[PDB]
Amino acid sequence: VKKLINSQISLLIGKGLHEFDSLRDPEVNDFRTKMRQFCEEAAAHRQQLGWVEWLQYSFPLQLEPNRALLVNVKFEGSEESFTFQVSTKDMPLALMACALRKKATVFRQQPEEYALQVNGRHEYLYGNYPLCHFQYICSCLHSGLTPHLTMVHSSSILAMRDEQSNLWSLEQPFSIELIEGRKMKLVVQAGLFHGNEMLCKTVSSSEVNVCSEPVWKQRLEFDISVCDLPRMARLCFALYAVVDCPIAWANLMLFDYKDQLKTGERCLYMWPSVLLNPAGTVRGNPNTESAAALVIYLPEVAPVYFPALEKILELLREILERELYEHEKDLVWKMRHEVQEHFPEALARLLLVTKWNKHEDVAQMLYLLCSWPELPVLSALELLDFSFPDCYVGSFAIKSLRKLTDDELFQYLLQLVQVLKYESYLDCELTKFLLGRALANRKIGHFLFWHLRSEMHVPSVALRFGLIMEAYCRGSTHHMKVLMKQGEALSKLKALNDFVKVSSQKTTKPQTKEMMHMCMRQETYMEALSHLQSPLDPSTLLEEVCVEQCTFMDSKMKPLWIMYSSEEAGSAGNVGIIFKNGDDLRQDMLTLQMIQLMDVLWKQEGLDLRMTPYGCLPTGDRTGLIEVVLHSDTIANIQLNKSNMAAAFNKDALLNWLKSKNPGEALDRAIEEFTLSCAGYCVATYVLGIGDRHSDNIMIRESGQLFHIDFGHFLGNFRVPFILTYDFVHVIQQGKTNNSEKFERFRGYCERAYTILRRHGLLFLHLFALMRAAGLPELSCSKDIQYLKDSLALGKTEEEALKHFRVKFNEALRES
Numbered sequence: 001v002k003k004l005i006n007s008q009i010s011l012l013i014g015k016g017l018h019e020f021d022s023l024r025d026p027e028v029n030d031f032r033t034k035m036r037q038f039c040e041e042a043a044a045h046r047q048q049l050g051w052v053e054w055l056q057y058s059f060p061l062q063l064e065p066n067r068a069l070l071v072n073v074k075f076e077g078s079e080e081s082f083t084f085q086v087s088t089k090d091m092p093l094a095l096m097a098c099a100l101r102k103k104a105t106v107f108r109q110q111p112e113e114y115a116l117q118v119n120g121r122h123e124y125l126y127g128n129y130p131l132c133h134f135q136y137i138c139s140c141l142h143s144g145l146t147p148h149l150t151m152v153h154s155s156s157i158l159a160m161r162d163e164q165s166n167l168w169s170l171e172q173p174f175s176i177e178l179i180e181g182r183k184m185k186l187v188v189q190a191g192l193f194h195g196n197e198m199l200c201k202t203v204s205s206s207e208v209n210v211c212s213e214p215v216w217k218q219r220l221e222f223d224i225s226v227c228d229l230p231r232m233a234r235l236c237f238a239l240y241a242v243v244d245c246p247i248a249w250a251n252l253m254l255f256d257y258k259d260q261l262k263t264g265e266r267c268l269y270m271w272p273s274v275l276l277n278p279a280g281t282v283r284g285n286p287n288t289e290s291a292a293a294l295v296i297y298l299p300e301v302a303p304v305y306f307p308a309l310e311k312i313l314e315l316l317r318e319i320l321e322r323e324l325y326e327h328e329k330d331l332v333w334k335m336r337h338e339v340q341e342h343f344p345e346a347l348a349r350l351l352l353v354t355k356w357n358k359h360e361d362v363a364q365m366l367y368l369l370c371s372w373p374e375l376p377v378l379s380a381l382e383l384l385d386f387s388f389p390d391c392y393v394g395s396f397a398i399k400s401l402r403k404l405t406d407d408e409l410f411q412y413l414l415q416l417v418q419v420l421k422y423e424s425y426l427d428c429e430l431t432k433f434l435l436g437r438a439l440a441n442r443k444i445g446h447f448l449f450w451h452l453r454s455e456m457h458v459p460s461v462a463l464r465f466g467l468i469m470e471a472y473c474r475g476s477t478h479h480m481k482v483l484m485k486q487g488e489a490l491s492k493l494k495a496l497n498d499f500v501k502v503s504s505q506k507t508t509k510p511q512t513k514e515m516m517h518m519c520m521r522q523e524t525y526m527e528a529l530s531h532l533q534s535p536l537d538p539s540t541l542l543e544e545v546c547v548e549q550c551t552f553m554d555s556k557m558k559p560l561w562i563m564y565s566s567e568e569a570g571s572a573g574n575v576g577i578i579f580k581n582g583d584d585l586r587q588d589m590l591t592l593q594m595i596q597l598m599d600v601l602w603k604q605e606g607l608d609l610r611m612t613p614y615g616c617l618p619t620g621d622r623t624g625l626i627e628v629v630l631h632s633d634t635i636a637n638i639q640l641n642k643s644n645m646a647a648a649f650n651k652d653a654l655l656n657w658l659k660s661k662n663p664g665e666a667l668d669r670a671i672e673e674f675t676l677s678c679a680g681y682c683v684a685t686y687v688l689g690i691g692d693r694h695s696d697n698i699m700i701r702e703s704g705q706l707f708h709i710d711f712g713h714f715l716g717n718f719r720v721p722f723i724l725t726y727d728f729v730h731v732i733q734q735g736k737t738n739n740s741e742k743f744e745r746f747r748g749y750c751e752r753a754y755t756i757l758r759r760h761g762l763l764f765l766h767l768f769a770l771m772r773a774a775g776l777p778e779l780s781c782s783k784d785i786q787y788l789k790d791s792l793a794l795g796k797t798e799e800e801a802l803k804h805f806r807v808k809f810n811e812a813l814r815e816s
């Protein structure tokens, strides 16, 4: 019985559990235990949660940041439905109060015992809040569509819970003896690093010939006392050749995870190259066989652990804040004590002057860290940055981070996961925290898994991600079932796309399309492809898959197009997803995630650019899912101006198009939608650098809202300036050649959107800092990020920045 599970875990996480054991690594062994029971006691807690507390776990709310409204309401055991009229300002209960009395009359005669399940979705309606504060309601009301809810009893929501049954004396210089290696001449650079910059000095070595397997036994000496290496400090090797050609690199913690200094001899299996790399990880390559190892000797010292801590309890400027000439590092460190007293939110600037190479400053720096008032989240995001490796800051950072909402957590989740690659050991506070939150919220649970599942093909993180995944599973056995269902859909889809690629090679679109439909209609594909939660959205219920509607785009990686339909969800149950295999999909997810962040900040200052935030989810190696936006066409299609329709100038295709989708008065609103979304995405794509936009990767929806697809290009990689296209300019202007009233309302939208993002310019900056961890080729250098500072123009005055933004815009009308 524990063997079925372990086995289902191996399947699910993409690595066999037996590969852990088989490592005889003690660090990994107590990781697996200290975490198995954090997680099971977490689940313990879970199966005794109250019923509403269960709803808040399995189906956490969806929420937006005077008039009336129609709502069909059901019950479980039946199909009889009543329509209502409630306003947008009622609570969920008014509805339920009113829902039972129209029953208490048919069945011929207590609203607090209930919840409104949205229909054919794992979404529910309950709480403090008005009706239109809800993400579904304020959404059905635009679409003007009737909400369809279900009165689900407390007895029913406990039934589901039930189902989910589970020292400092050493003052000589530190040095290593080099030994052998196993792949002109050969060089071996080595630095002592803490975070970003180095403690000691650069230390090359004896030259040898590429005649190698080489042997060095040169005693390599480092410029720093031993009593003064910090608790971290990573030692950082690098192997090249000249008469410079990079070869491999390798890092390692100078201390045991269990705290003690590292002696004495060990073997370093190195990762290759492309030139000395403090940021790569401090575990070694799994490729044992192929891998160039390096062997060194970490010398002896008597069993010196690293001192616990009541015994580091030992001990006009401000044209300053928010790079130095550090004839100013002084006054910062000098009067550090009332930095803490009178300026707490500059903790970071301080750590970035603290001496890590000498333990007296560190002990003193840490001394102010424990008394430090906690920070605002924006600040804690800063401290996660690589250049604050320190266990303690990271503890402080995590400490200040518990004041996150599950909503903001979900909003920064992709970065926090990237941060997991910096961590120097396995059992860190961030991991404990993420699993804590994840186990405590099933939407968080969902997306944490997939952020990890999607990287198990990358050797540098397969072990850690694997390890956490398994823990998550030990604490959520049921949710493991639901994720298998998903991973199997994706397994099959992949096979089906392989077939579609191959088949399309030798035959026509109707033939391959009709062939695919049979592949699908096999018993095995119908079972796998149906009746699962959507990896893109766990409240979306992919149920009965419509094969007649499935197709594939006749382009290079032949993405698939899968429609679905729930009968107990009606029209809002007919949804689709896109399978794409071939491309790395992490670039887009980042882009769509940031854009969605833009729509939140704008909405939080009362500005709705009617944006369009479709899910994008990478699931595996160059493989992931994209969410389908029904009722939408590419501009490029629309502008082909074909015959059929009911356009004398190509300029008018788009507008005519718009007209035919919105006759009578509805064309007013669509133009408006159009104008708003076009302001959003124009500013979105200008701030972010999104390149070569053309009518093939811009889509418009019948409502009018336009949105962008295919985000390959990013942060102005080929300075990307503002773009305004004549033919949306022509739609904005309702047809007219000279509609300055409608066009400048449009310029304002843009200016507002731009200024609102500028006041959070720092959030985006902190968030792009952490993503540097992600290996995204168009996001690695220090000055890919300066693109975002000169976009946001964050170093100018608000009246000045908007001066220059105004130049950029005006030059972009001028193209048309």
Ligand SMILES: C[C@H](Nc1ncnc(N)c1C#Cc1cn[nH]c1)c1nc2cccc(Cl)c2c(=O)n1-c1ccccc1
Pocket (backbone or CB within 6 Å): 551, 552, 553, 554, 558, 559, 560, 561, 578, 579, 588, 614, 626, 627, 628, 629, 630, 632, 633, 634, 637, 709, 710, 711
């Ligand atoms: C370009 C269009 N794309 C999206 N359509 C809606 N909703 C989205 N979410 C996306 C998307 C996307 C995307 C791709 N890369 N990054 C994001 C699209 N993508 C496809 C992908 C695979 C297979 C097919 Cl058969 C199609 C397909 O027919 N269209 C399409 C073309 C014109 C009119 C309607 C549909």
